[PDB]
Design a protein around this ligand. Structure first.
Ligand SMILES: Cc1ncc(C[n+]2csc(CCO)c2C)c(N)n1
Length: 104
């Protein structure tokens, strides 16, 4: 990996996009989609968006390869569900891990 760690699977978000075609594609493809996030530890960092870009990148990179060779074929629609919920989870894992990095 280089220095990345899986936070774990998303606790079934019930979140949103504002685009009903992406709402549906979440409920219709979540069985196939990459539902978990890999990050570098927050210790070298101070800000979510840049870290979170690397976090969505490493989980999408590994897990798209893992799921395509199981029988999948993601689209820009699946990427937009993935990128949203992974980015939300990456930023939420940053919040918890950054609180713990302040706590000890
Ligand atoms: C895991 C999960 N993610 C997204 C939605 C979809 N959804 C929630 S708000 C809204 C956007 C349109 O107002 C839609 C319909 C869901 N139900 N479950």
């Amino acid at each position: 990996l280089g220095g990345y760690m899986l936070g774990s699977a998303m606790s079934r978000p019930m979140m949103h996009f504002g685009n009903d075609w992406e709402d549906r594609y979440y409920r219709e493809n979540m069985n196939r989609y990459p539902n978990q996030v890999y990050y570098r530890p927050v210790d070298q960092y101070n800000n979510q968006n840049n870290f979170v870009h690397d976090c969505v990148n490493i989980t999408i990179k590994q897990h798209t390869v893992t799921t395509t060779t199981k029988g999948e074929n993601f689209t820009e629609t699946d990427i937009k569900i993935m990128e949203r919920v992974v980015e939300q989870m990456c930023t939420t894992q940053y919040q918890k891990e950054s609180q713990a990095y302040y706590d000890g």
